[PDB]
């Protein structure tokens, strides 16, 4: 059993700790703990995502990014949190600014913590891309350029990369598979499944199978809008999951 | 998503913060967060449950109960965590002491966060009693006296309670249904299902059906060891799920 509920006291306490360590120009264990705690409490928990935004957490995110450009673990925690935020369709309009999009697009090239920062920046952008071109508006950079950079980032990642991530459910990723609005979002989502069933099959083959991923990946192979690179990863995931049974 | 709890040593990070806040005699937001995180990351994750016990989380739990006897969310979070530990059969022998059993039994009367602490302590005892009187050593209080307190707690709860717990799967609760070793564990489990399908049928009716709950409930209705009131709840759960 579990309990995933918003708690303003959690969120406000964490942001206040962040703000203090930002004023101290100190990215120590408390600073990293604080962002990791925000990551934790937003995992499958939209109400804490909404609170993080409503207490102006994005300002602290940008200020920490500028102040601590080389603290890879810090960047990982922040982008994992933002990954959770972007899964909430109702909150993504708030991410559609040139200031924010330019950061996410730039982070696609980050080498911090293996691939986690680039991966989670790509997830944020994958959920954003899923909403379609009219949601993008006049944001800069342009959507077609960000898309090019997402393809490049996904192609640059070792499919057998070690990972500092956990999923209790694949359903935010699975919802990016049966659509043709954004093939690159579908490709990120398929890659996300392929990497995890490759490095942790004992955990993620059963989760993927239990949550109905096999028929969705079969549909991807039949889908005209799916790129052939995506179809081939889908075939390999189905294959690995089938042998795991 | 979240980080890799294993690679990051995250369980110990939480227990270290707990210990520090304990010595500070401070149950603040961070202390509550730490126990809340432990509850959430032990859900269906036996290895995090074993990490908790191995690093003496039981003593931190007892010491926090003593130092913070009126902190309601804290007590709920700690007992939800222990509810997850208790679901792991291999770990339940570590709970069979007079010190631990007595604390679980006392908490059946707790009013903290509505019914949540009482319910979580009843769940821990329900899984413990599923193992039979052999597993109960000369542990004191007596097994039957705890059982009587369990029946009383369950009857006190509002069947229509809105709840501060959720389940990704009913399987730990459903395994308490097809057995006569502990009728009170069966009754707790039937109540848990009946409350959640009553109050949140859109989430929990499909889950219960999909996970095979209907044949288990029908077996209860025919079972010699299930009490009449357990059978009557089971019938209503079946009715609610069939009309769903």
From Swiss-Prot, chain B:
One of its GO terms (cellular component) is Cul2-RING ubiquitin ligase complex. GO terms for biological process: positive regulation of proteasomal ubiquitin-dependent protein catabolic process; protein quality control for misfolded or incompletely synthesized proteins. Changing residue 39 to A: Complete loss of N-degron binding. ARM repeats lie at residues 5-43, 45-87, 89-130, 201-243. Expressed in testis, spermatocytes and spermatids (at protein level). Expressed in spermatocytes, spermatids, prostate, skeletal muscle, ovary, small intestine, heart, brain and pancreas. Keywords: Acetylation, Leucine-rich repeat, Repeat, Ubl conjugation pathway. Interacts with the ELOC-ELOB/Elongin BC complex. Part of an E3 ubiquitin ligase complex including ZER1, CUL2 and Elongin BC. Serves as substrate adapter subunit in the E3 ubiquitin ligase complex ZYG11B-CUL2-Elongin BC. Acts to target substrates bearing N-terminal degrons for proteasomal degradation with the first four residues of substrates being the key recognition elements. Involved in the clearance of proteolytic fragments generated by caspase cleavage during apoptosis since N-terminal glycine degrons are strongly enriched at caspase cleavage sites. Also important in the quality control of protein N-myristoylation in which N-terminal glycine degrons are conditionally exposed after a failure of N-myristoylation. Belongs to the zyg-11 family. This is Protein zer-1 homolog. The gene is ZER1. The chain holds residues 518 to 757 of 766 of the full protein.
